[PDB]
Design a protein around this nucleic acid. Structure first.
Ligand SMILES: [Mg+2]
Ligand SMILES: [Mg+2]
Ligand SMILES: [Mg+2]
Ligand SMILES: [Mg+2]
Ligand SMILES: [Mg+2]
Ligand SMILES: [Mg+2]
Ligand SMILES: [Mg+2]
Ligand SMILES: [Mg+2]
Ligand SMILES: [Mg+2]
Ligand SMILES: [Mg+2]
Ligand SMILES: [Mg+2]
Ligand SMILES: [Mg+2]
Ligand SMILES: [Mg+2]
Ligand SMILES: [Mg+2]
Ligand SMILES: [Mg+2]
Ligand SMILES: [Mg+2]
Ligand SMILES: [Mg+2]
Ligand SMILES: [Mg+2]
Ligand SMILES: [Mg+2]
Ligand SMILES: [Mg+2]
Ligand SMILES: [Mg+2]
Ligand SMILES: [Mg+2]
Ligand SMILES: [Mg+2]
Ligand SMILES: [Mg+2]
Ligand SMILES: [Mg+2]
Ligand SMILES: [Mg+2]
Lengths: 175, 213, 168, 159
RNA sequence: GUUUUAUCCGGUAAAGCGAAUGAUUAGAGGUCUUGGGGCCGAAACGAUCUCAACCUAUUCUCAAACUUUAAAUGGGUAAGAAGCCCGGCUCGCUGGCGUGGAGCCGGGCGUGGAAUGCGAGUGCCUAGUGGGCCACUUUUGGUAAGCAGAACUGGCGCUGCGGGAUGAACCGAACGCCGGGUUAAGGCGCCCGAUGCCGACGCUCAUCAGACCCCAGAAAAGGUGUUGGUUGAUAUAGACAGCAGGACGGUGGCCAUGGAAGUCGGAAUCCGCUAAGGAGUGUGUAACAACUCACCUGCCGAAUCAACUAGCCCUGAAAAUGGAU
RNA sequence: CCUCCCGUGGAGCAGAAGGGCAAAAGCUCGCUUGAUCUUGAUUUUCAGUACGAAUACAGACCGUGAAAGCGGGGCCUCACGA
RNA sequence: CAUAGCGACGUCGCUUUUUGAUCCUUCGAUGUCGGCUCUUCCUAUCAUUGUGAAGCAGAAUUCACCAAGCGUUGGAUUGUU
RNA sequence: GUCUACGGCCAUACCACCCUGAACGCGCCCGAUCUCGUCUGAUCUCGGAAGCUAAGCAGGGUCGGGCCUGGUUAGUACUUGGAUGGGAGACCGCCUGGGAAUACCGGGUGCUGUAGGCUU
């Protein structure tokens, strides 16, 4: 599974009605996938892991995107996940700050790739939850819980290094 | 005169047991598989800790003997000679072969090279899978750190990567430790020696009424 | 929940070339009239056709065309197989002479028969020469892997229309 | 270096199934084999006479000749890049009637019945069996219940 | 060289050994015997104690030449007009029977009885070849081999072109002579076409850094380098770290002895004082002694400690002409 | 040696192994010579050549059994020669 | 007194200065051992320079580090290496 | 509701032990002149009808063993096809489809064809 900017999909599926259970149970998951096709594939992967279902013997009755109900509010996301390292499987709890849930999950995927070299096919996101600021455990997140937060931008590197490519004045980094 | 164990590390051949076709096999290095207080009852040693392989490979009999000796020495030093029971969980049933060459300054001397290359039995190794248990130690619940250290010291006698694991089972049995006490209480388990006998609720009622009596 | 009817029309595009193909994949691609890279063909969906598409899965990209995709394909690259020749569908008489016995006499009848899979879908589909589409403008993601793992092969459900827009 | 023995490699092929040794049940001898009917060659090893070769075990052919104890079967054998219809004499212990032919004749009889009945009552009916069509649209009710939310389980080493 | 729908075929992978055939670990319970024997049994082992053999129920570990069970992939057949259903005739075959079977002769049935694709059938003459090799996967011998030998498909040979700097086989793609557009695999500091994006998030400093399939170099084991993560513990009834005290009595506890007095060794862990203290974690004194630890206390006033785990980096890491992301 | 009971074959079937087999294919008796005279077809190796081996028939002459039947060598897979 | 100096049972590597294994190049030929002579290169360092450690009191010796700048000889026997 | 004779499938039918069995029947049972076989009229063969359901046999039972069939094990082990996926390797993860077997826990314990009897 590749990535991009992930979206949250509420995927609902069930077994096909058979003359043993005419109304099989409906099951629901939150899938974070680049698009709905990958969302359906990952839904089948997970419900095959959990229940004894297959894409052939079941159907998906709903696959819709879950829009964030407060994209204008900063909130703390705690993520429980498991992944396979080069020499085993580990359960992890990670914390992120973002406006959207899927944005925090994308942050998590990038961070796992950056720190643990974990490719996205190795990572299983098993719970995403908004947490209050007093329940945060990571100091990298807790240091933003200040109502009087204040910091400068110390060493602003020039990014327009080629417009102009040649000039007389040497750039300033203090602003 | 033994070859380095790197030459027979991987499970490259089919299993080659000592059978009526494979004759002339030298006896395995390891002959004893249980040490400590083997006669200890089930309730005496509740904690059980396994040492689990992480690679599909071959463990030689000499390696098992060395690891067993090391773990025995550390357990005797720490918990006393009667405070533990160890069980080596691998048996060297696979025979490795050697196509012996003359180690002199001559190839004309009937060396024949690779002609008739099928070798003769060198020794025996144990084939271990990923997730398979190599050694198990059961002891008092207060010697967990000593079991972990003894199994850690035995890991250095083996080629690949191994993990130490404290099982949820009671001792060497297959029943979970939390369920063990209340299963013995209602007589679903009957201790006998180092193991327990599961008593299913079916069969003649005579074997039921010899219990509860 | 309303579960829509499963799609009964698929547009299959062959995305890999003709070098080093296993015999079964090669035979199935011949049966799909996909003998060249970036060739397109409408496939009526059922158990047999779906299993055939499963056989050649790494070599094809397929999905469910909408009405606009069918219209663009038939109108821009629609060529008829008339007397075993590849004739451009420039006149309605070309359709009428070869398919009038089935009631298909114009471009619109052909497009309706292809879109809503009718009684005579086999004849109308075999009449169409397989669509010789260009290279996808903007490039592909990865032709060697599946769509659900970042590539281009396999069944993209309704994203085949984006590929069609970039393709012809 | 392989031998060319007639029964090489048939250690399990011609062996009897578990707890199915002993006397051959007599209804195998009571079957009626006409010319032209379809039989499956199996080859039980209890009866050593009239045995088929190992290359015909599991093959299916058409009976063309009937004798006292055996039948003549025309069976296709593939040799290099050609298929040739071999003719073999196999005792009836090693064959049985093919059920595919029985099902097909049943279908033909039922189709002729449908044709006659439909012509009598005028309404057209479908006879050509179709491949499994795509599932049509349908409504899946909840009956006032929330579908269960499933989450992948955390990892732990078991055994 | 395809699927689908029916219908058979199989014994590989797996699995099993509290199921057969072989291999094999350990205890448990019983009671016969040319088991040893067993202390007081000779006297009827008056007795009944151990270990054997044996049996029973369990228990650990296995099989290319074992197996109850048993896949995936796979092999065969069928999916009609040469069919179906009616009547009749022939037979020296068969025979209770106007029986069975086979053949033959008339007649009626087309919704042409799955999907997809394709035009097929047939004959003659015939060159070259009969040294092969390589790659994924399966697989035999061998420590291994750019070794030797098999299965399947593809390729090189017979093949040029884009990429892998370079390369018979790798990746893309197969080729008439050209123009425009677009791509594949692969790339976009400069060589050298293209990131001269105000690209996004992190990780990492190497006095041998690292840098892309095949592929052209590394392992076990370590790190108080840094970054995540798991589990557990301590703490305003004041943690942690520093600095300062007590660290006893019986008892220089018993058996060791030549001193071993807590510390050359064997067993057990007493009590009371309480602030605590092991009849001891180590240094050691010939021995004492003098030290230190674990344990508490004083000052110190907010968080702290431990064991693992895995990312990059470092150690492990040595060869010859000067040199190779 | 005799007797009873349990006994799925854990024995035997000439031999190597595998398959097969219990009022069997094994053991003991009785009678025999189908291990005989013939023509073709077929399978196995296969080039669908031969040898060898084998399967199913058909025509004689017989054996056995009350009979149904079985038998043209050995329960099957080797034991051979232009 | 495990680790000053060693290291059993095991187990992980490196080298191509041994001998094998293989047979890819060379059979219309690549002159096949040793010695002599001469140059350069490697370090897995014998000595020398600077060091760390010891069961380093001194002397002698042992282990290790940076390190190949410089040196590593004269003869009896043997075709010898 | 059953039995006898001949069977088909060949344990849901077998195995161990216990209980019951009305009427036919099947048997046990009596005997050795004849037929026929024996070391032995035990078996076999023949001729019977005093007694008995004790046995065979039939039916039922056993927290029975076995067998049959489910569930669990488990979408686990294994596996078709794919990638310039990871890893020094050994091997592992993912995509695409298929998918087992113990232990453990339930349920069941012959069905039936032809001919001929019995059962108020
Ligand atoms: Mg060596
Ligand atoms: Mg091998
Ligand atoms: Mg290619
Ligand atoms: Mg462009
Ligand atoms: Mg490829
Ligand atoms: Mg296996
Ligand atoms: Mg066994
Ligand atoms: Mg050759
Ligand atoms: Mg080779
Ligand atoms: Mg050539
Ligand atoms: Mg070619
Ligand atoms: Mg080429
Ligand atoms: Mg090139
Ligand atoms: Mg390169
Ligand atoms: Mg061009
Ligand atoms: Mg470049
Ligand atoms: Mg440029
Ligand atoms: Mg390094
Ligand atoms: Mg005859
Ligand atoms: Mg015979
Ligand atoms: Mg060669
Ligand atoms: Mg020359
Ligand atoms: Mg020269
Ligand atoms: Mg050095
Ligand atoms: Mg039972
Ligand atoms: Mg799979």
């Amino acid at each position: 599974k590749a990535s991009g900017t992930l979206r949250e999909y509420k995927v609902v599926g069930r077994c096909l009605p058979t003359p043993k259970c005419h109304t099989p149970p409906l099951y629901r998951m939150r899938i974070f996938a680049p698009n709905h096709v990958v969302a359906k594939s990952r839904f089948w992967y997970f419900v095959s892991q959990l229940k004894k279902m297959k894409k052939s013997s079941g159907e998906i009755v709903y696959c819709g995107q879950v829009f964030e109900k407060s994209p204008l509010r900063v909130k703390n996301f705690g993520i429980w996940l498991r992944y396979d390292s080069r020499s085993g499987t580990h359960n992890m709890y990670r914390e992120y700050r973002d406006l959207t849930t899927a944005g925090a999950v994308t942050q998590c995927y990038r961070d796992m790739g950056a720190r643990h070299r974990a490719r996205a096919h190795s990572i299983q996101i098993m719970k995403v939850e908004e947490i209050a600021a007093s329940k945060c455990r990571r100091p990298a997140v807790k240091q933003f819980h200040d109502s009087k937060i204040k910091f400068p931008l110390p060493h602003r590197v020039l990014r327009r290094q080629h417009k102009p490519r040649f000039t007389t004045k040497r750039p300033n980094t203090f602003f | 005169g033994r070859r380095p164990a790197r030459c027979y590390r991987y499970c490259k051949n089919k299993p080659y047991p000592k059978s009526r076709f494979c004759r002339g096999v030298p006896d395995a290095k390891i002959r004893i598989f249980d040490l400590g207080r083997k006669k200890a009852k089930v309730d005496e040693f509740p904690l059980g800790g396994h040492m689990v392989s992480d690679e599909y490979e071959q463990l030689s009999s000499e390696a098992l003997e060395a690891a067993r000796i090391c773990a025995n020495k550390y357990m005797v030093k720490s918990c006393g000679r009667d405070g533990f029971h160890m069980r080596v969980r691998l048996h060297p049933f696979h025979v490795i072969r050697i196509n012996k060459m003359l180690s002199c300054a001559g190839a004309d001397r009937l060396q024949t090279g690779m002609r008739g290359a099928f070798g003769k039995p060198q020794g025996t190794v144990a084939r271990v899978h990923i997730g398979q248990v190599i050694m198990s130690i059961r002891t008092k619940l207060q010697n967990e750190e000593h079991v972990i250290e003894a199994l850690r010291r035995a890991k250095f006698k083996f080629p690949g990567r191994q993990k130490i694991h404290i099982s949820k089972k009671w001792g060497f049995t297959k029943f979970n430790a939390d369920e063990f006490e209340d299963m013995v209480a209602k007589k679903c388990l009957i201790p006998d020696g180092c193991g327990v006998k599961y008593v299913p609720s079916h069969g003649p009622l005579d074997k039921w009424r010899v219990l509860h009596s | 929940f309303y579960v829509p009817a499963e799609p009964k029309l698929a547009f299959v595009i062959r995305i890999r070339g003709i070098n080093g193909v296993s015999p079964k994949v090669r035979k199935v691609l011949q049966l799909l009239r996909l003998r060249q890279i970036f060739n397109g063909t409408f496939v009526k969906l059922n158990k047999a056709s779906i299993n055939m598409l499963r056989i050649v899965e790494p070599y094809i990209a397929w999905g469910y065309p909408n009405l606009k995709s069918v219209n663009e394909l038939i109108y821009k690259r629609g060529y008829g197989k008339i007397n075993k020749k590849r004739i451009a569908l420039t006149d309605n008489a070309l359709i009428a002479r070869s398919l009038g016995k089935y009631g298909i006499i114009c471009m619109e009848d052909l497009i309706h028969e292809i879109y809503t899979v009718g009684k005579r879908f086999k004849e109308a589909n075999n009449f169409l020469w397989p669509f010789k589409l260009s290279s996808p403008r903007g490039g592909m993601k990865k032709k060697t892997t599946h769509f659900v793992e970042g590539g281009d092969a396999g069944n993209r459900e309704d994203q085949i229309n984006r590929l069609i827009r970039r393709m012809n | 270096t392989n031998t060319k023995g007639k029964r090489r490699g048939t250690r399990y092929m011609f062996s009897r199934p578990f707890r199915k040794h002993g006397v051959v049940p007599l209804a195998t001898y009571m079957r009626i084999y006409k010319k032209g009917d379809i039989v499956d060659i199996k080859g039980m090893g209890t009866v050593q006479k009239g045995m088929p070769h190992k290359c015909y075990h599991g093959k299916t052919g058409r009976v063309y000749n009937v004798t006292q104890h055996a039948v003549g079967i025309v069976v296709n054998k593939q040799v290099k890049g050609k298929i040739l219809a071999k003719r073999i004499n196999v005792r009836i212990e090693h064959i049985k009637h093919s059920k595919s032919r029985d099902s097909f004749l049943k279908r033909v009889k039922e189709n002729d019945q449908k044709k006659k009945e439909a012509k009598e009552k005028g309404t057209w009916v479908q006879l050509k069996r179709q491949p499994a069509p795509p599932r049509e649209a349908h409504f899946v009710r909840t009956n006032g219940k929330e579908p269960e939310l499933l989450e992948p389980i955390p990892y732990e080493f078991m055994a």
